[PDB]
């Protein structure tokens, strides 16, 4: 229904700001951290971001295509990343619950980082094109 509280069309979400110490909203599932390191060849004990911004590159009429950019040591990159929001009524819903979106990322060594296995102190801007998980 068009007055259903906290109901938003996923394809029209333009951007996200995700915090490591905040939880997602959830009605059907279970709140999770908005921003979570879930693995990687460098592990989640290396530097981890506290906030990540993601843009929906298809917000102006197309399917969702999340791009999440940050600055990391040149030793590191994001591996696979996954954005996921809670479908309002089900995982098949094109409407999602406001506040329910979150990012999971893996923190890998780059091919240069694998040579050294520690931080260089030099940084690079890096963008991940996330896969989307329907839930």
PDB file of C-alpha atoms in Angstrom:
ATOM      1  CA  UNK A   1       0.000   0.000   0.000  1.00  0.00           C
ATOM      2  CA  UNK A   2       1.273   3.426  -0.864  1.00  0.00           C
ATOM      3  CA  UNK A   3       1.130   4.651   2.753  1.00  0.00           C
ATOM      4  CA  UNK A   4       2.922   1.595   4.176  1.00  0.00           C
ATOM      5  CA  UNK A   5       5.504   2.932   6.664  1.00  0.00           C
ATOM      6  CA  UNK A   6       9.175   2.816   5.693  1.00  0.00           C
ATOM      7  CA  UNK A   7       8.449   1.374   2.218  1.00  0.00           C
ATOM      8  CA  UNK A   8      10.746   2.542  -0.590  1.00  0.00           C
ATOM      9  CA  UNK A   9      11.275   1.495  -4.177  1.00  0.00           C
ATOM     10  CA  UNK A  10      14.736  -0.094  -4.367  1.00  0.00           C
ATOM     11  CA  UNK A  11      15.462   1.189  -7.875  1.00  0.00           C
ATOM     12  CA  UNK A  12      14.983   4.785  -6.685  1.00  0.00           C
ATOM     13  CA  UNK A  13      17.441   4.608  -3.749  1.00  0.00           C
ATOM     14  CA  UNK A  14      20.227   6.887  -4.932  1.00  0.00           C
ATOM     15  CA  UNK A  15      22.920   6.394  -2.293  1.00  0.00           C
ATOM     16  CA  UNK A  16      23.786   4.847   1.054  1.00  0.00           C
ATOM     17  CA  UNK A  17      25.978   5.925   3.964  1.00  0.00           C
ATOM     18  CA  UNK A  18      26.858   2.845   5.995  1.00  0.00           C
ATOM     19  CA  UNK A  19      28.426   2.891   9.454  1.00  0.00           C
ATOM     20  CA  UNK A  20      30.388   0.099  11.124  1.00  0.00           C
ATOM     21  CA  UNK A  21      28.695   0.737  14.501  1.00  0.00           C
ATOM     22  CA  UNK A  22      25.073   1.083  13.339  1.00  0.00           C
ATOM     23  CA  UNK A  23      22.609  -1.711  12.630  1.00  0.00           C
ATOM     24  CA  UNK A  24      20.188  -2.113   9.765  1.00  0.00           C
ATOM     25  CA  UNK A  25      16.452  -2.052  10.279  1.00  0.00           C
ATOM     26  CA  UNK A  26      14.629  -5.349   9.880  1.00  0.00           C
ATOM     27  CA  UNK A  27      11.008  -6.480  10.092  1.00  0.00           C
ATOM     28  CA  UNK A  28      11.125  -9.983   8.615  1.00  0.00           C
ATOM     29  CA  UNK A  29      14.753 -10.846   9.314  1.00  0.00           C
ATOM     30  CA  UNK A  30      17.335  -9.803  11.929  1.00  0.00           C
ATOM     31  CA  UNK A  31      19.266  -6.483  12.143  1.00  0.00           C
ATOM     32  CA  UNK A  32      22.899  -6.703  11.060  1.00  0.00           C
ATOM     33  CA  UNK A  33      25.743  -4.180  11.090  1.00  0.00           C
ATOM     34  CA  UNK A  34      25.323  -1.648   8.280  1.00  0.00           C
ATOM     35  CA  UNK A  35      28.978  -2.146   7.312  1.00  0.00           C
ATOM     36  CA  UNK A  36      30.764  -5.444   7.871  1.00  0.00           C
ATOM     37  CA  UNK A  37      34.130  -6.949   7.010  1.00  0.00           C
ATOM     38  CA  UNK A  38      33.400 -10.633   6.363  1.00  0.00           C
ATOM     39  CA  UNK A  39      36.810 -11.933   5.299  1.00  0.00           C
ATOM     40  CA  UNK A  40      39.556 -11.448   2.752  1.00  0.00           C
ATOM     41  CA  UNK A  41      43.165 -12.485   2.227  1.00  0.00           C
ATOM     42  CA  UNK A  42      44.287  -9.534   4.394  1.00  0.00           C
ATOM     43  CA  UNK A  43      41.700 -10.241   7.077  1.00  0.00           C
ATOM     44  CA  UNK A  44      39.462  -7.947   9.054  1.00  0.00           C
ATOM     45  CA  UNK A  45      42.051  -7.075  11.704  1.00  0.00           C
ATOM     46  CA  UNK A  46      43.860  -4.807   9.225  1.00  0.00           C
ATOM     47  CA  UNK A  47      42.574  -1.255   8.858  1.00  0.00           C
ATOM     48  CA  UNK A  48      38.804  -1.331   8.484  1.00  0.00           C
ATOM     49  CA  UNK A  49      36.660   1.642   7.432  1.00  0.00           C
ATOM     50  CA  UNK A  50      34.165   3.096   9.868  1.00  0.00           C
ATOM     51  CA  UNK A  51      31.981   4.603   7.129  1.00  0.00           C
ATOM     52  CA  UNK A  52      31.502   3.781   3.427  1.00  0.00           C
ATOM     53  CA  UNK A  53      29.327   5.608   0.895  1.00  0.00           C
ATOM     54  CA  UNK A  54      27.701   3.664  -1.942  1.00  0.00           C
ATOM     55  CA  UNK A  55      26.018   5.093  -5.035  1.00  0.00           C
ATOM     56  CA  UNK A  56      23.308   3.395  -7.059  1.00  0.00           C
ATOM     57  CA  UNK A  57      24.621   3.942 -10.584  1.00  0.00           C
ATOM     58  CA  UNK A  58      21.315   2.830 -12.098  1.00  0.00           C
ATOM     59  CA  UNK A  59      19.047   5.046  -9.993  1.00  0.00           C
ATOM     60  CA  UNK A  60      17.862   7.069 -13.020  1.00  0.00           C
ATOM     61  CA  UNK A  61      15.663   4.361 -14.511  1.00  0.00           C
ATOM     62  CA  UNK A  62      17.729   1.142 -14.504  1.00  0.00           C
ATOM     63  CA  UNK A  63      18.383  -1.862 -12.283  1.00  0.00           C
ATOM     64  CA  UNK A  64      20.448  -1.403  -9.140  1.00  0.00           C
ATOM     65  CA  UNK A  65      24.195  -1.276  -9.657  1.00  0.00           C
ATOM     66  CA  UNK A  66      25.886  -0.369  -6.400  1.00  0.00           C
ATOM     67  CA  UNK A  67      29.316   1.237  -6.465  1.00  0.00           C
ATOM     68  CA  UNK A  68      31.126   1.713  -3.149  1.00  0.00           C
ATOM     69  CA  UNK A  69      34.311   3.787  -3.141  1.00  0.00           C
ATOM     70  CA  UNK A  70      36.872   4.449  -0.443  1.00  0.00           C
ATOM     71  CA  UNK A  71      40.560   5.089   0.095  1.00  0.00           C
ATOM     72  CA  UNK A  72      42.777   2.220   1.206  1.00  0.00           C
ATOM     73  CA  UNK A  73      46.449   1.475   1.500  1.00  0.00           C
ATOM     74  CA  UNK A  74      47.872   0.323  -1.847  1.00  0.00           C
ATOM     75  CA  UNK A  75      48.513  -3.000  -0.126  1.00  0.00           C
ATOM     76  CA  UNK A  76      44.740  -3.568  -0.050  1.00  0.00           C
ATOM     77  CA  UNK A  77      41.628  -3.782  -2.181  1.00  0.00           C
ATOM     78  CA  UNK A  78      38.079  -4.866  -1.594  1.00  0.00           C
ATOM     79  CA  UNK A  79      37.451  -8.410  -2.763  1.00  0.00           C
ATOM     80  CA  UNK A  80      33.881  -9.410  -3.482  1.00  0.00           C
ATOM     81  CA  UNK A  81      31.439  -6.948  -1.971  1.00  0.00           C
ATOM     82  CA  UNK A  82      27.709  -7.457  -1.508  1.00  0.00           C
ATOM     83  CA  UNK A  83      24.988  -4.868  -0.903  1.00  0.00           C
ATOM     84  CA  UNK A  84      21.680  -6.190   0.405  1.00  0.00           C
ATOM     85  CA  UNK A  85      18.431  -4.569   1.567  1.00  0.00           C
ATOM     86  CA  UNK A  86      15.336  -6.194   3.046  1.00  0.00           C
ATOM     87  CA  UNK A  87      12.485  -6.605   0.585  1.00  0.00           C
ATOM     88  CA  UNK A  88       9.405  -5.068   2.146  1.00  0.00           C
ATOM     89  CA  UNK A  89       7.156  -8.139   1.811  1.00  0.00           C
ATOM     90  CA  UNK A  90       9.675 -10.778   0.609  1.00  0.00           C
ATOM     91  CA  UNK A  91      13.003 -11.231  -1.138  1.00  0.00           C
ATOM     92  CA  UNK A  92      11.152 -10.848  -4.467  1.00  0.00           C
ATOM     93  CA  UNK A  93       9.781  -7.390  -3.571  1.00  0.00           C
ATOM     94  CA  UNK A  94      10.885  -4.420  -5.666  1.00  0.00           C
ATOM     95  CA  UNK A  95      10.123  -2.299  -2.567  1.00  0.00           C
ATOM     96  CA  UNK A  96      12.545  -2.472   0.352  1.00  0.00           C
ATOM     97  CA  UNK A  97      12.476  -1.429   3.993  1.00  0.00           C
ATOM     98  CA  UNK A  98      13.889   2.018   4.739  1.00  0.00           C
ATOM     99  CA  UNK A  99      17.126   1.719   6.691  1.00  0.00           C
ATOM    100  CA  UNK A 100      17.600  -1.981   5.927  1.00  0.00           C
ATOM    101  CA  UNK A 101      20.480  -1.751   3.420  1.00  0.00           C
ATOM    102  CA  UNK A 102      23.977  -2.910   4.332  1.00  0.00           C
ATOM    103  CA  UNK A 103      27.361  -3.605   2.780  1.00  0.00           C
ATOM    104  CA  UNK A 104      29.540  -6.671   3.337  1.00  0.00           C
ATOM    105  CA  UNK A 105      33.083  -6.535   2.038  1.00  0.00           C
ATOM    106  CA  UNK A 106      36.185  -8.674   1.930  1.00  0.00           C
ATOM    107  CA  UNK A 107      39.575  -7.038   2.448  1.00  0.00           C
ATOM    108  CA  UNK A 108      42.231  -8.552   0.170  1.00  0.00           C
ATOM    109  CA  UNK A 109      45.845  -7.889  -0.529  1.00  0.00           C
ATOM    110  CA  UNK A 110      46.493  -6.473  -3.975  1.00  0.00           C
ATOM    111  CA  UNK A 111      49.120  -8.208  -6.071  1.00  0.00           C
ATOM    112  CA  UNK A 112      51.570  -5.623  -4.701  1.00  0.00           C
ATOM    113  CA  UNK A 113      50.353  -6.126  -1.137  1.00  0.00           C
ATOM    114  CA  UNK A 114      50.949  -9.874  -1.422  1.00  0.00           C
ATOM    115  CA  UNK A 115      54.655  -9.158  -1.962  1.00  0.00           C
ATOM    116  CA  UNK A 116      54.904  -7.219   1.322  1.00  0.00           C
ATOM    117  CA  UNK A 117      52.132  -8.428   3.677  1.00  0.00           C
ATOM    118  CA  UNK A 118      51.938  -5.079   5.480  1.00  0.00           C
ATOM    119  CA  UNK A 119      50.769  -1.534   4.870  1.00  0.00           C
ATOM    120  CA  UNK A 120      52.806   0.735   2.608  1.00  0.00           C
ATOM    121  CA  UNK A 121      51.480   3.975   4.047  1.00  0.00           C
ATOM    122  CA  UNK A 122      50.565   5.084   0.510  1.00  0.00           C
ATOM    123  CA  UNK A 123      46.864   5.250  -0.342  1.00  0.00           C
ATOM    124  CA  UNK A 124      44.693   4.873  -3.419  1.00  0.00           C
ATOM    125  CA  UNK A 125      41.065   5.622  -4.198  1.00  0.00           C
ATOM    126  CA  UNK A 126      39.276   2.338  -4.957  1.00  0.00           C
ATOM    127  CA  UNK A 127      35.733   1.588  -6.118  1.00  0.00           C
ATOM    128  CA  UNK A 128      33.977  -1.743  -5.762  1.00  0.00           C
ATOM    129  CA  UNK A 129      31.028  -2.680  -7.925  1.00  0.00           C
ATOM    130  CA  UNK A 130      29.014  -4.699  -5.466  1.00  0.00           C
ATOM    131  CA  UNK A 131      26.840  -7.666  -6.182  1.00  0.00           C
ATOM    132  CA  UNK A 132      23.292  -7.350  -4.868  1.00  0.00           C
ATOM    133  CA  UNK A 133      21.772 -10.044  -2.643  1.00  0.00           C
ATOM    134  CA  UNK A 134      17.955 -10.202  -2.600  1.00  0.00           C
ATOM    135  CA  UNK A 135      16.534 -10.933   0.844  1.00  0.00           C
TER     136      UNK A 135
END
